[PDB]
């Protein structure tokens, strides 16, 4: 019967919740009480990239920490050179409605997608020197919200159809499909080892997925509204979520609990992007307050603010070497903060 | 450097293509289309000419881009902000949906469901300034429907006869009462005319009014 399984199912949530309390020995805030603070983090706009004629939704750094990508509703995908602020490529999109970007780890490929329900992959290194579109991954039924390359052939995408998928670019078919989210999936983050990835959905939950098996290992709750951004800790043993509850939370994968909440009474708008520092000591979160805060990731004390944007800070990414932090916004400008 | 000097030449050559493309996109008119499944938005699109559907058509040297976003079937709360800065929001409601009901719900009218969608859109924080064109389709089918069936089935309170002229006029004014931004946005309501092809001309006149009124705002002559 439905009630047999339901009265059963609500019990299974109890042992999960019962065991999590038993493993809640002491709060990270108590353990990190005597750590010396990070001090005022004064970070200034070094470079400002101009050339977008609409609001920016997505940006992604390169693995060489110098090039980066950005997409906007103007239907242009631009590859920047952050050092010399000069445009390397300006890719016209078939669909002006683009909500995500990814720059391949090898830098041979770039991918974008949005309301057109397609993940388009553009080839950068092309004999005829004109970025050409390679493949169009059309297997989703809702807007694509995120996409992250594993290799030049594997890309994992999260869509508004409550499902994530792992693709094979050569064949253009979903190698694996991740199901179990009861709300629209907003963002995903890959583990450093590229064996696991966590996804945040509109159902106020984050799920840890396994890329090979295709089954969800753990599910984290605690937020009150949509989860809009997610990133792993550098060591791949923790991750942070940005929600519309104007709180960032640091979850652990081994302890399977929540550690911190980064909430401030002053802040009432929703978090749009989150990202870490190379050491994992700073958690940069791009709010709707038009500004971007920098949190002490082990003290939960707002040490630093990056207020330079007219409109909301849509995307926010840090370099692999951690020498810079770049924030996009709806004001059509990318700013490099160092 | 010799290499770096030639690099900056590209960046300027890129920027000049973006401006030329940006100034081409600025002249284009962006209309967002909404409504119920059976509204007649399909029939409106036919007169004018999965995922998000774009329709391009030209009228009197003006270029229109109509974004039929009916096929998204996901949470509007996450992607409706993408359409902030459209010239107008075309909205289609079928007048012949007053006595009907959705195949899923028991006795909640299709017309009352149209209002619930209209209330959330006209008062959406993203479309505080955006004008709404409101098409009311299937007007001749509504005339046949009202001549035999009463209008009390949908609106419990109604002072007026079963006459097309008065029956329709109540609905139009009933739809126009949903907006609280009365002095910020203008709703241009039209009854669909099949053969005349005036539906596209009404869009022309409604769009220019929103452009002309806006031009008077930013120059201060208003």
């Amino acid at each position, epitope marked *: 019967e439905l009630d047999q399984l339901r009265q059963e199912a609500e019990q299974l949530k109890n042992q999960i919740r019962d065991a999590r309390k038993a493993c809640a020995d002491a709060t990270l805030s108590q353990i990190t009480n005597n750590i010396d603070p990070v001090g005022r983090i004064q970070m200034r706009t070094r470079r400002t990239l101009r050339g977008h004629l609409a609001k920016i939704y997505a940006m992604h750094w390169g693995t060489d920490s*110098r*090039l980066l990508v950005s997409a906007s509703q103007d239907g242009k995908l631009i590859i920047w*050179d952050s050092y*010399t602020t*000069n445009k*390397v*490529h300006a890719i016209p999109l078939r669909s002006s409605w683009v909500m995500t970007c990814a720059y391949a780890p090898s830098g041979n490929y770039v991918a974008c997608g949005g309301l057109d329900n397609i993940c388009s992959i553009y080839n950068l*290194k092309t*004999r*005829e*020197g*004109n970025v050409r579109v390679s493949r169009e991954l059309a297997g989703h039924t809702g807007y694509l919200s995120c996409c992250r390359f594993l290799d030049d052939n594997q890309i994992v995408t999260s869509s508004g159809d409550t499902t994530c998928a792992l693709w094979d670019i050569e064949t253009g078919q979903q190698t694996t499909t991740f199901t179990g989210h009861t709300g629209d999936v907003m963002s995903l983050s890959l583990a450093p080892d590229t064996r696991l990835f966590v996804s945040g959905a509109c159902d106020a939950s984050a799920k840890l997925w396994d890329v090979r098996e295709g089954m969800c290992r753990q599910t984290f709750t605690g937020h009150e509204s949509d989860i809009n951004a997610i990133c792993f800790f550098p060591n791949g043993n923790a991750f942070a979520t940005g929600s519309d509850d104007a709180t960032c939370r640091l979850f652990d994968l081994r302890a399977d609990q929540e550690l911190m909440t980064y909430s401030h009474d002053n802040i009432i708008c929703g978090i749009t992007s989150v990202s870490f520092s190379k050491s994992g000591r700073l958690l940069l979160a791009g709010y709707d307050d038009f500004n971007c805060n920098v949190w002490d990731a082990l003290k939960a004390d707002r040490a630093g603010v990056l207020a330079g944007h007219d409109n909301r800070v849509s995307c926010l990414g840090v370099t692999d070497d951690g020498m810079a932090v770049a924030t996009g916004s709806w004001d059509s400008f990318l700013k490099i903060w160092n | *450097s*010799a*290499e*770096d*000097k*030639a*690099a900056v*030449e*590209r960046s*300027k*050559m890129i920027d000049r293509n973006l401006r030329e493309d940006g100034e081409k996109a600025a002249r284009e008119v962006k209309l967002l289309l909404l409504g119920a499944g059976e509204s007649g938005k399909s029939t409106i699109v036919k007169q004018m000419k999965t995922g998000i559907v774009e329709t391009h058509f030209t009228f009197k040297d003006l270029h229109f881009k109509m974004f039929d976003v009916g096929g998204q079937r996901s949470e509007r709360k996450k992607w409706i902000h993408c359409f902030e800065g459209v010239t107008a929001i075309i909205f289609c409601v079928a007048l012949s949906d007053y006595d009907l009901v959705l195949a899923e719900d028991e006795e909640m009218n299709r017309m009352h469901e149209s209002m619930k969608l209209f209330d959330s859109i006209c008062n959406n924080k993203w479309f505080t300034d955006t004008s709404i064109i409101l098409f009311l389709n299937k007007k001749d089918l509504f005339e046949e429907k009202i001549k035999k069936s009463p209008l009390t089935i949908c609106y419990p309170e109604y002072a007026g006869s079963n006459t097309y002229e008065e029956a329709a006029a109540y609905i139009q004014c009933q739809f126009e009462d949903l907006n609280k931004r009365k002095d910020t946005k203008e709703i241009y309501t039209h009854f669909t005319c099949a053969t005349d092809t005036k539906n596209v001309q009404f869009v022309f006149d409604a769009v220019t009014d929103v452009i002309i009124k806006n031009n008077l705002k930013d120059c201060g002559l208003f």
Partner: single-chain antibody
Framework: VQLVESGGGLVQPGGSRKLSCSASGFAFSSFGMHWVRQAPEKGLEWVAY????????YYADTVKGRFTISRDDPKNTLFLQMTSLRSEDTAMYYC??????????????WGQGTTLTVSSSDIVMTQATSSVPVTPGESVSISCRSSKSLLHSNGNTYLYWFLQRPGQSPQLLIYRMSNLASGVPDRFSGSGSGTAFTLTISRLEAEDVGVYYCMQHLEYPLTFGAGTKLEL
């Protein structure tokens, strides 16, 4: 992606002839083109250059004000207008394409060139090795020397390498020191700093025997080096 040029042949001195290079199979409108000439017995020598969209036109010392270079983007052609040819303009005129953006490979593709026989503050690159004997399966190193520190401020040593097999157009091997071109085996490698440069081949074959060239790109007019022919 082939490049073919038209013209050349036999011209009396003082005559004005035109060279047309019809690009086919690539985005010609976004490629900075060059011209490089090779004397019948001597090495390469840069002559001209046009940037993307005809924004920047440069020339060599021997052809300044004598040659006019133009491109026709819609027709995918490149033109060279030569005026009052001298006896020292007898050379095979290759056409080279190059694109400049972060991490690009300029001078990657070379035309077949045309034969032209007229009737009758500059960096100098020096390599004093010629007709060096070598056997297949051995390791050979080719050394180059510059008169100027090619290592720019940003750390880019704008030194290139080329390989011209007998009876073929020159082919890029190394577009900057410690970099490897596209479609060239891993055997070729180059390590150097400032004014000293080397090209190391681990194991070679009958296919890669020929003459090698060294070019700098720190500043115009892109002076080349003398040849370095591998003897086999």
């Amino acid at each position: 992606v082939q490049l073919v040029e038209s013209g050349g042949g036999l011209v009396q001195p003082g005559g004005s002839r035109k060279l047309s290079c019809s690009a086919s199979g690539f985005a010609f409108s976004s490629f900075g083109m060059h011209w490089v000439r090779q004397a019948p017995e001597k090495g390469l020598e840069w002559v001209a250059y046009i940037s993307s969209g005809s924004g920047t036109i440069y020339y060599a010392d021997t052809v300044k004000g004598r040659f006019t270079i133009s491109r026709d983007d819609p027709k995918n052609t490149l033109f060279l207008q030569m005026t009052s040819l001298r006896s020292e303009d007898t050379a095979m005129y290759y056409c080279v394409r190059s694109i400049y953006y972060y991490g690009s490979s300029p001078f990657d593709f070379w035309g077949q060139g045309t034969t032209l026989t007229v009737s009758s503050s500059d960096i100098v690159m020096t390599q004093a090795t010629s007709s060096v004997p070598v056997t297949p399966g051995e390791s050979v190193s080719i050394s180059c020397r510059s008169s100027k520190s090619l290592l720019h401020s940003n750390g880019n040593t704008y030194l290139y390498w080329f390989l011209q097999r007998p009876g073929q157009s020159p082919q890029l091997l190394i577009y900057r020191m410690s970099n490897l071109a596209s479609g060239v085996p891993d055997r070729f490698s180059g390590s150097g700093s400032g004014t000293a440069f080397t090209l190391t081949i681990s194991r070679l074959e009958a296919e890669d025997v020929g003459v090698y060239y060294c070019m700098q790109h720190l500043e115009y007019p892109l002076t080349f080096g003398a040849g370095t022919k591998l003897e086999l």
